[PDB]
Amino acid sequence: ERNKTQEEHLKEIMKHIVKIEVKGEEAVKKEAAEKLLEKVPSDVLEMYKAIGGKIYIVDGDITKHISLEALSEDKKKIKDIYGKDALLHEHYVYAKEGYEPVLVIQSSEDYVENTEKALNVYYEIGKILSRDILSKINQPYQKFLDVLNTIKNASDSDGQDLLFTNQLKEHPTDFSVEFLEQNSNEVQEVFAKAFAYYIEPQHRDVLQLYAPEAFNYMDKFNEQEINLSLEELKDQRMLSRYEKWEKIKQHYQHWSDSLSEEGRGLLKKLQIPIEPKKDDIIHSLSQEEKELLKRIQIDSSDFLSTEEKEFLKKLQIDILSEKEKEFLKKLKLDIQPYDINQRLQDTGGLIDSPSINLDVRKQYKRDIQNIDALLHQSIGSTLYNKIYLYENMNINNLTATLGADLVDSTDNTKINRGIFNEFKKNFKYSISSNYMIVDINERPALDNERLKWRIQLSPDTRAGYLENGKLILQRNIGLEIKDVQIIKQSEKEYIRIDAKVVPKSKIDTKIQEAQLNINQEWNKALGLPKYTKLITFNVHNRYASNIVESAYLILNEWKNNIQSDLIKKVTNYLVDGNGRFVFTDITLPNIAEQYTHQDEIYEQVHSKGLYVPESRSILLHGPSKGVELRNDSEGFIHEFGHAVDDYAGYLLDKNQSDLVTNSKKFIDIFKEEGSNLTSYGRTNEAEFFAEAFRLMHSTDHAERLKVQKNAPKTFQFINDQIKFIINS
Ligand SMILES: O=C(O)CCN1C(=O)/C(=C\c2ccc(-c3ccc(Cl)cc3)o2)SC1=S
Ligand SMILES: [Zn+2]
Structure with a gap:
């Protein structure tokens, strides 16, 4: 709490922007405004300074002061917090808007007693914040819009009554982004109003009493989130952007001046892959x-x-x-490009993975160990404290499946709220298995990059400095997600993801405990020995927590659409052979449940899901979009089809290991109905069986029907296999 500096900094900040100009009582007045402005979050005073604004504490008819004479006279009649018209030459506060903003406050000392006035002052400051500050970084936006709707569409109408004008009171539907666009003045007003009530301690209770959501919002915003607002605001300032770059540049000056030719060569081929x-x-x-x-x-x-x-x-x-x-x-x-970063991502850092020829595996390992040694110097410096770095990312990289509907189908400048919420759902932690290349100051993204990360580095985080204003970070970074929200930048909507760097072990422990939990839970549901390692998380990439949390959801769907006794018999069979339900985010060719049973390397398979008989395991890749398989659940269940095709055909020639989908009986069923279901199902016997099996156990009952009336003999077949297995 070395906050005394926050008071001293609030002291130095006042020093510049606060200009006292009164009678002679400059002491009782000067220290009076100190008490009035102390209630305001320090960071808003510095933001006001940033935009060149100034505060004047004067006496008498404020409209008299120099800075307000150039006032078109009509602007001489304002409105107070309550909406009652007044006259500037009669009022005690005014915030001149414009490219040279000014705040004029008529001196006093009863700001302590007269809560109404302080309130009004805070409202004008709140107005400065939402109209002069936040607008320069496109806020308030969706987040705040949600608070507003929560209020209008709430049980008690008191919240509205306290903060809404009838213009918003009467508005029919919720407040869309388009509404906030042509009613800017309106939203900014509500913001200031809630900011005001929150800041004036006497009214805070009333705010929390009749408008809880507004209270919680302004609470979180003035306690933490405002700092990021200041950060983003400094990010638009030229000299600010360049000053930051320079301190980082010189912190690494020695590292740079010392880099060899080989050194530079490595960083460069790590930025531009070599095509065959x-x-x-x-x-x-x-x-x-x-x-x-x-x-x-x-x-x-x-x-x-x-x-x-x-x-x-x-x-x-x-x-x-x-x-x-x-x-x-x-x-x-x-013919695959030599892409070091791609190799780390594909393998989740498991660079000994036999998924590519031994000659290139070795070249990747040599270059990687070398890069790891180059990026030895951590960011921590005496030239600065907390440091934010930026990264523009393509969502497909995290989830192609959702990435498919992120952008608004009709208006590409908008983000689809539905997919946004789903994408944000269980996004808590993330991992970086390759070298993140981030920007010192935020920069414009590519068309396919609608994800803008604002990462707070650890002073421990190691990195390398690049002349173009970027840093290459060490691999194996841990990241906690602090906030996911929709923002607008340059006539375009993006998903801002605020993340904090932490030790990769902290995140691994979370995954590792998750694995423990999920097996404890499902071993009990299935009647498996207490400590069987059935489910396994092989998580190493940027959408880490999602892989984990989706597993629970996938298995729940799996159990609610299939006969409990079919699951048990089959999974006991899988377990008996040391099978595994592997949920990963590294490409399948690097899961050994598949690779330790290959003859040749090229015989590898990568896709949404895959069933491996030899290891009796089901592998499910998180990031990709299954060949038009609605979601992860459908894909997992599809793979379970193969699992069944295995246990059934095993209960066939008991003394062997053949698939029941090989039987002439089924081959012929496929010979006739093998085209009635899906194209993917048309691929071959086992695939047709798996697709059919899947649709039959779909959540969409209409699906089930399709098979029943387009693959009748197949439907009756799969069912025969079910009862077979269940009674056997
Ligand atoms: O390419 C695709 O999209 C389909 C990938 N896929 C599959 O390929 C599935 C299982 C699978 C395919 C082939 C085999 C196979 C398994 C063992 C052996 Cl010896 C030979 C082939 O299992 S499940 C699934 S999804
Ligand atoms: Zn398949």
């Missing part, structure tokens, strides 16, 4: 390979994407058979 060059791709294929290249109709594969498809296409132009699919599986590995 045709010339080499070709000179790595024996003629046999080479002609099967010119022969194979690239555009016929499946596992290959556009760029991958395209790139390959130029390999022919430069010079589905089971074997040739095996040829492409290889090329897919060799």
Whole structure:
């Protein structure tokens, strides 16, 4: 609480902006305004200074003062907190708006006694805050709009009565962003009004009494969130942005002047991946390979994407058979860009993962250990205290599935509130397994980047300084999420995510305890031995907590749509083989439940979900959008289909390990109905079975019906397998 400095700083701040100009009693008056302004959060006084504003404590008819003479006379008739018209040459306060803002307060000492006046002064200050300060950083916005609606659409109308004008009282629907746009003056007024009631200690109770939400809002805002407001406000100031950059630049001056050529080379290839060059791709294929290249109709594969498809296409132009699919599986590995940061993210930092050829694995490890040694100097310095860094991010990176509907379908400048709430839901902690490249001062994002992180670094956080005003951070950072809200920047809506850096171990302990909890819970629900390790969280990336919290939801859906005894028999079977329900955010090829049972590396599979018979495990990737699989639940249940196809076919030739989807009986059922369900289900036997199984146990009962009337024989089949397994 080295707050005495906050008083001394509030003292020094007053020093500049506060200009006393009275009779001669300059002491009883001067120290009177000190008591009046002390009630205000220090940080709003500094914001006012930032925008060049000044405070004058004068005597008599305030409209007389120099700064208010240039006042179009009509502006000489204001309104008090209560909305009753008054006359500036009769009032005691006024806040001149404009590019040279001014606050004029008629001296007094009874601000202590006359609560009404102080109240009014605070209201004018509240007005300065919402009309002169926050507007320069596009606030108030959605968050505050929510408070306003909470109030208008609340049981007791008293809240409205206390803070709303009839203009807002009578407004039909809630206050949209568009409303706050053409009624700016209006919202700013309510803000100031609530700010006022909150600041004047006598009225605080009334505010909390009839308008709790407004109270809680202004409470949190004046205690913590205002500091960030000041921060964002300083971020628009040129000299402020440059001063910050300079202190950081010189803190790392020695680190820089000492970086070698190899040093710089490393940081650079870490910023720009090296794309594969045709010339080499070709000179790595024996003629046999080479002609099967010119022969194979690239555009016929499946596992290959556009760029991958395209790139390959130029390999022919430069010079589905089971074997040739095996040829492409290889090329897919060799045509991937050398992207250090991508490698860390894909593996969650598990760089020994046998998901790529040994030669490149080693080159990635060599470059990574080297980068890890380069970024040895922590940010902590004597040139500054708390330090904020910024990062513009593409939401698909966290959740493609939600990223799909983030932007408003009709108006791309808007963020869809529904998806926003869902995205914000269980976002509490995050992890960085690669090197975050952040900006010293916030900068404009790319079109696909509607996520703007404001990260508070630890003085411990290690980083590297880049000449262009960015920092490369050490890998393995821990991040707690402090606030997620919609903001507007340059005619465009973004999702501001306020995060604080903490030790990665703190977050891991949270995940690790979560794993313990979820297994304790489901081992009991399923009747498994107390300590079986069934569910496993392999979490290492930026949407970390979501992977964790979605697991509970996924398994709950899983249990509420399937026969309890079907679950038990099957999961006991899985457990018997050391199976696992793996929820991860690293690509599947790096989960060993899959890779330790591969013959070749290229035989790897990455997708939304995957069932591995050898390990009897279900793997579910969080970040991606399952091939048009509504959500994670559908995907997990789909994978459970394969699980069943396994346990049923096992109860078939008991003495073996074959799938019940291989039976001639089903193959024929597929031969006829294999196209009635989904395209993905059309893929093959087991897939058709899994898709069918999935729809049958969908939450959408209409879904179930589709199978029943478009795959009747299949429907009756899956059911046969169910009773089979249940009674066996
Ligand atoms: O590409 C896709 O989108 C489908 C990925 N996917 C699958 O590929 C699924 C399971 C799966 C596929 C193939 C196999 C398989 C499993 C073992 C062996 Cl030896 C051979 C193939 O399991 S579940 C799922 S989703
Ligand atoms: Zn499948």
